[PDB]
């Protein structure tokens, strides 16, 4: 369980920005992988047809 802050946060901008960087990185990874899956779908389609 989280404590209660006793002193004001220093450089909160940097920490919030680090969090934002993490989340955006993961979202971009998701975006790439989704394309991976779609290309795999087309691969499978051509394979089954042939």
């Amino acid at each position: 369980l989280a404590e209660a802050a006793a002193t004001t946060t220093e450089n909160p901008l940097q920490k919030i920005d680090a969090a934002l960087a993490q989340v955006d990185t993961l979202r971009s990874d998701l975006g790439a992988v989704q394309n991976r899956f779609n290309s795999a779908i087309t691969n499978l389609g051509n394979t089954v047809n042939n």
Binding site: Q14, D17, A18, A21
Partner: protein, 50 residues
Amino acid sequence: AAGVTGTASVVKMSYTDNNGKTIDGGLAVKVGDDYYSATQNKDGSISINT
């Protein structure tokens, strides 16, 4: 064991970009210009990730 020659110390990572924005990470071990990602032992000592 790895044969790394030099002083061993624990440092905190800071990164800056071309925009001028800056961020900070976790902990690591720096020998000369080299670095190694570090993990905190529960007692306050430090270990190198492998």
